[PDB]
Amino acid sequence: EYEERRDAEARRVKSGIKQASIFTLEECARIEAKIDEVVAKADKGLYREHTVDRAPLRNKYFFGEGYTQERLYSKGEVDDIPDWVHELVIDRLVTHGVIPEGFVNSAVINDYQPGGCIVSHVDPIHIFERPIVSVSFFSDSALCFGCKFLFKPIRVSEPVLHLPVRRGSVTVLSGYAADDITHCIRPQDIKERRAVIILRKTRADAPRLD
Ligand SMILES: [Mn+2]
DSSP states (O other), rough: OOOOHHHHHHHHHHHHHEEEEOOOOHHHHHHHHHHHHHHHHTTTOSSGGEEEETTEEEEEEEESSOOOOOOOOOOSSSBOOOOIIIIIIIIHHTTTTSSOOTTOOOEEEEEEOOTTOEEEEOOOOOTTOOOOOEEESSOOEEEEOOOOETTTTEEEESSEEEEEEEEEEEEOHHHHHHTTTEEEEEEGGSSSSSSEEEOBBBOOOOOBBO
């Protein structure tokens, strides 16, 4: 086995993955321009503090709700979801039946430089409802599931599933793929700048800082 036990788990992950395109590349370029405006605005220090999280090779921009055992920030700590995210992204996904109207109340933009990554994690199940929707921009990459980020020496273990995410791809995670296995972006899979908009609903009973 191994091949079979691994294909077996890959099938479980796949059962919780739905992908779509919908956006044309022209439509992507327009959204990408707005993402660049967010980056420029943040660089000028025009946002609330907790909206912007800067890391080596990766910035995160939190709108609607942000979090930091994870807890939501108090209300009013992060910026509102920009009108363009509603108009160009969320509304399109609603009209296409990907998510219900009124579902999304959190939008996070991750912006990666080449070599940037995000370590294996499960989107906090006490904070976020499912499904988790993401839309990718600027360049093609891949989302990996089940990788372990190891040390001595630094390495990433073999993925249970490697899922190509092309520019303009909509990725919807639910069930096993969202709850029972981690996902990550490996450094080797970010060769050019890539950004992604993650759209989520927070749970009514999500714990929140005072
Ligand atoms: Mn995630």
